[PDB]
Design a protein around this nucleic acid. Structure first.
Ligand SMILES: [Zn+2]
Length: 252
DNA sequence: AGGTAGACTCGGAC
DNA sequence: GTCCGAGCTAC
């Protein structure tokens, strides 16, 4: 799920679990559990707690319980569902939170790639994986000035900068390529080479790109196809270790 | 110093 | 057998 999808998950899941009390936690793939390191401690501590809220930070879900917060990252294919304990589990179900009402919050992930961390609520923000997370891209805390400051200080490409979770929260590969296209900026450009004008324009398109989604791609995955603005074939290379898509005419 | 790159996690699709 | 996407170790 992308940031906008996580926000949608956050919004839709909350009513389905709020006020429910955990009676058991069943773990079928312990490696998903990152903190406490022992999956048996993770399960034990959550038993008896009631779900009070669900927040989002970047692509992280933060389940707020009585004492603890469960911080959950789904990566690409992780999915939550609420369903009856009487019915068979779906394939690739790795963790199940059983509620006293006979319902379950189930975490599936064919890729077994997601993570869960549990800490006392008051500690979650200063521990992994939330520690160091940059500002929400739709927040005033993410400004052209902030972006400019990170850009000047680094030798990395502008794409590498935008992919940095400490720079801005949860801006994935797709939105990075799309935003840079809309801003007219090549992804391989050194971040420090961007003019003030370019920094402003980039900030503006990041917000619009991700803002529009929280309510049709120009370049991502469209390599070999015509640019939608100028008809030039979209190209794909590797930048910052990622598949990178761009129009060599629109972007400079 | 810490910025930065690399290792590492996984399995569906070539 | 090799790729790839997000987010602790060691130069
Ligand atoms: Zn173009």
């Amino acid at each position: 799920p992308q940031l906008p999808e996580v926000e949608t998950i956050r919004r839709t899941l909350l009513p389905l679990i709020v006020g429910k009390t955990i009676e058991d936690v069943r773990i079928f793939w312990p490696n998903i559990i990152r903190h406490p390191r022992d999956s048996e401690a993770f399960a034990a501590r959550m038993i008896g707690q009631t779900v009070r809220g669900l927040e989002r930070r970047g692509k992280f879900l933060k389940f707020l319980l009585d004492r603890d917060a469960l911080i959950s990252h789904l990566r690409a294919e992780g999915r939550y569902a609420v369903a009856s304990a009487l019915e068979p589990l779906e394939p690739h179900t790795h963790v199940v939170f059983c509620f006293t009402d006979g319902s379950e919050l189930r975490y599936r992930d064919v890729r077994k790639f997601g993570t869960m961390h549990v800490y006392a609520k008051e500690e979650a923000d200063r521990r992994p994986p939330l520690a160091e997370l940059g500002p929400e891209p739709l927040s005033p805390a993410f400004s052209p000035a902030v972006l400019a400051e990170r850009a000047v200080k680094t030798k990395r490409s502008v794409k590498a900068l935008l992919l940095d979770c400490t720079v801005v929260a949860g801006f994935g590969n797709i939105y990075v390529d799309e935003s840079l296209f809309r801003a007219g900026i090549l992804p391989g450009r050194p971040a420090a080479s961007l003019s003030s004008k370019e920094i402003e324009r980039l900030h503006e398109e990041m917000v619009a790109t991700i803002g529009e989604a929280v309510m049709h791609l120009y370049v991502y995955g469209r390599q070999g196809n015509p640019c939608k603005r100028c008809g030039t074939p979209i190209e794909k290379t590797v930048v910052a270790g990622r598949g990178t898509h761009y129009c060599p005419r629109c972007q400079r």
